[PDB]
Amino acid sequence: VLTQSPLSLPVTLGQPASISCRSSQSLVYSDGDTYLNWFQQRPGQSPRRLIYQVSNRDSGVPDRFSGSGSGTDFTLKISRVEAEDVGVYYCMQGSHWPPTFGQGTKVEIK
């Protein structure tokens, strides 16, 4: 079970934003790693991964995306939110089966 906050993030174009995710249990797996990923779903499109293993980014992902966290408390950070960054940011844990997602944070540009 993952809970995200805020439900909706009102960020002025060009300004930074961050999305929080809180787990009901430590997401540290048996091998010591942490399988907490972040996905962004743009309206009209499916989810895509941006950040994995808490803070690493996928190839093709803009350097403005980063993150940090441990245990139960994780954050997705965006150094500046652009118009193209509109969408719902989900946190996902694969550490404990069944894998789960948060409710998603709707980030909009003001």
Binding site: Y35, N37, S46, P47, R49, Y52, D58, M92, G94, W97
Partner: peptide, 27 residues
């Protein structure tokens, strides 16, 4: 309903195929 898989199959065994889930279809 989304079709989902992974690009990285370095550890193709339980439960590691739940760790990335980085490939999604249109739904």
């Amino acid at each position: 309903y989304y079709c989902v898989t992974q690009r990285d199959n370095s550890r193709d065994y339980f439960p590691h195929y739940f760790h990335d889930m980085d490939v999604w279809g249109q739904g």
